[PDB]
Amino acid sequence: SSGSSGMQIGKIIKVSGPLVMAENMSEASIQDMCLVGDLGVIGEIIEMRQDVASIQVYEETSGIGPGEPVRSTGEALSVELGPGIISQMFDGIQRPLDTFMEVTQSNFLGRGVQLPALDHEKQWWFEATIEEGTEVSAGDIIGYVDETKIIQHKIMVPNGIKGTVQKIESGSFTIDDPICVIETEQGLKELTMMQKWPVRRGRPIKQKLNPDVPMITGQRVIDTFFPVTKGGAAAVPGPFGAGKTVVQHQIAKWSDVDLVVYVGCGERGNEMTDVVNEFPELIDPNTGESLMERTVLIANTSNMPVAAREASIYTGITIAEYFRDMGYDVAIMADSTSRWAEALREMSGRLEEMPGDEGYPAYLGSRLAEYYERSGRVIALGSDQREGSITAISAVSPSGGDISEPVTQNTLRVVKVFWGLDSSLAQKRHFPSINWIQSYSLYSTEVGRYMDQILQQDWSDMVTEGMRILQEEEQLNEIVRLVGIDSLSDNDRLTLEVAKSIREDYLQQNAFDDVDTFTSREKQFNMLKVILTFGKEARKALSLGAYFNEIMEGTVAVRERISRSKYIPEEELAKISSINEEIKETIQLIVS
Template sequence: MGKILEINGPLVKLELPQTVLGEQVRVGHMGLVGEVIGRDGDTALAQLYEDTAGLRPGEIAEGLGWPLSVELGPGLLGAIFDGVQRPLQAVWEQSGDRIARGVAVPSLPRDKAWHFVPDSALHAGSVLAGGTVLGTVQETESILHRILTPPLIQGELLELAPEGDYTIEEVIGRVKLADGRIEKLHLFHRWPVRTPRPFRQRDHAVAPLITGQRILDTFYPLLKGGKAAIPGPFGAGKTMLQQQIARWCNAEIVIYVGCGERGNELTDVLEFMPELKDPHTGRPLMERTLLVANTSNMPVVAREASIYVGITLAEYFRDQGYDVVMVADSTSRWAEALREVAGRLGQMPVEEGYPAYLGSRLAAFYERAGRVETFAGDHGSVTLIGAVSPPGGDFSEPVTSHTKEIIQTFWALSKELADARHYPAVDWLESFSGYVKSAAKWWSQEVDPNWESARAEALDLLAASEELQRIVNLVGVEALSSEQRWTLEAAGLIKEGLLLQAATDEVDSFASPEKQFALLAALLEIYRQGMKLVKLGAPARRLIQIPILAQARRWKSQHTSEDIAALKAKIAMIPDAFEPLLQEYASTAAPSTLREAAP
């Protein structure tokens, strides 16, 4: 037992010999919890996860003997945890509307019994290794929770409980370790959050994560097991885009970490998720979702921990063979928490006050993403999507620039697009994806062999129009040739008919890969038809009056993803729309010079 020597904001100096760095401590009469971040002789420096007001020098302190860990087992799905995995719903029931300090509620419910079905291949004498599936619990209708042997356990199975209902604290099996000790098995185990969970080996990521958002899937794809960042100034629609991804993506588990963000936003997620159906299974979305919430007004040290709690939960489901998406909103707030603590420790600041280890911490965090072969021989993945909130929208600031070096897919949000209410405001020139080649394989097999070339054609068109727009801004649209004007018009069509996607529109909110490609192909077809006419001498100002240009802009919200046939029928009609003009110019193209010459 030790005591408090000094209190300075969230940092507390303790007289507490023999503690280990990273060890959890309980401090003061309120029982505030924190972790040791420094040792000097008999004193330890700890950062507390809760507000320290009211603590006094001389109060007691004790080391708990383990690092910050999470409980992994049935009961996780549909829950909302704070940054150190306290279940907020249960905390609310116990301590009221406001989070009282020192409240201790176990992360997973202790009284609930789960129906456990042991793995039929296992019997007394089986050799168990870490990660072996002991059996299953049907946790929600859509998710089968595989009960895993804790990663570091290895030995001979002595007994395994028969099928039946068990709470997570009941013993479901015993295993004899190599050194002869007997270890009890439960439906859950603990794992320290700052240590990545082990797996057999890393795999190549192969399949794209389908989010239903056209600018993401079609133009800047992300793979299952990949790393992405969404940087954007405030008001650029970062949260909305992340919620769209959480809502529609084809991962089996979604973990949403609200790190230093708005309380009302989490409430929004909490209130609207249960009403929504998983587009892939038809079950309520909440059954596959898990929230970690450390809002901006909650203590800063727990905010730093929340990211690690989230990724550890993600890895746990990955180890069960699931494709997991973790959305971290926002990594900038996490970095700021790091900075705040570093500042109080008096560490030398480098850029904008951030400590020198910011880059390496970020890299190590993102490296926990990936597709792996699990110990059980399955494949699972963690896809990591980190939001970045650059101050003033300046992408050269430390967190954005470090992140940019680490991730493969960069969805840059633009203030200008958002101001014009072009959502999702993903900038098609600033964004990039390193996964296009891998994604192309999937798209050409599953959707259309021309995906890669169509994508490239559309991007070229967008880039060309950006150049042209600059000319227009200087000298006006009249200065452009017909061909250039048509290019500009077609790029506008792609922007409004394809890239612009209304999250609030029932039909438009999600687009299947098939619909995405059909729309892209349709708009490109319009472009090509028009270009053919321009080449025949038709002036652009006549082309842009063809009604199909306005109609095509509405197709995305007129046809659902199930209704591809009707969309394709419209594509077949595109040449008809150009037919009258074509007739006119095809017949006059050759002799027109003659006619003009002879008045």
């Protein structure tokens, strides 16, 4: 027009909340990003009727109307994967929140502000691992970068690229500078330390494997009764005030994973603030590095734009997949997927779609299923054939605590671990407030074998018995409620006390106690053995004609000793296992 010509420019024909309609978009494709309006707010095309495109805006659309331009970027919702991503706090669409504040000189989130996810002007030292003239394909490592003092950022060959390494050399570079040249069949392609990848598409692997190795969380109730494996997925649904944040924070601080991708998906702003302040103050005494130097944080709070909740989930899992491909064990945490689903429902109303369950779109279930199936223990691409894993810890916030709701039920269809948080336990100061009766882990049998082999003791037998006692306790409490505790046989009264010890001395764990916050696998074993030993020694004493009241009143000292065993330092384990002999001999003098 007018003697000149440029790129295609869209034109808004309607603004309805987070949904924007733009004509003259024929050059654009589905799932493509575009800048919407004068402000150029980030938007994703989800539908297309002729030249008119339905756009889902990941920012506020207030003060936007028809006539304003729309400019497509041509590419899908991607993340920037390269050195400079670790220890960063991004938003839903991977915009650096710290840089955002400095560039805009504002404490508040404006809109239409484009910011590269990573620092493209920071010099990194690249170290070449591969020699020139080698045949490479997707996944193969050409070199690494020491992003942190412990985590090597392995620069691997992008997907869709296969050929011979022609030029490579170590040295200082930016993530824009060509560090390697590959001779492909198409020609010469330059590889940078950085690569992009569409967040809605799962990153390719060779194959999935069985998640058979249990993750050490240090949280006794989890590691023992409801274990999660590396590659496994856990659902953490519960009412408000059940302390899901503390449970998640604990899993972040103490899991034996290389990297944590924490995703604040539509939750309290303070809790994201609490992470960036506390995590760099939690130092591993061995590595000397803080938790923040293995953490990628994605924050889209409850009052931030709704559509970006969905984007935050996918931004997170894709970054997790990225490091997984390096051969790393990653933990992806979503808090909480309920608000992700609420974002889906929000758009679904705008799209004038038909709801399936409780107003949620009919495709909710599969959205979730496709997400958790992106997790697991895999063999990454490349000749290396290295193994990496992604462990998913997802919080669910079922309304009223009722877990019959679609998101919980759809999640429990695909994941094998259910940590049911309880409100009544929260009020009774029982932390973690994990309902040991309702909660389950379908990895318990496999972990049971892994434990029995690595400990060379009957651990699975111990866990089974402890859990049996706990369920028998719940049956007895029914009866106590009806007839009173006085009517119970001295064998059943003993069961209540053994279970009480299991709840109070083992199940309960204070995340804010320097000793109790973490419990090693062998310490866990020693603690449980002691508690169970008391039951066995007492129960065989009852058969010898001993009464419950004498055994109980004559063990005040040693039962108590079990109560503080949780506060016994990891170095001084002997002090815990020594109780076994004390119990046995204290019981003996009662038998006389």
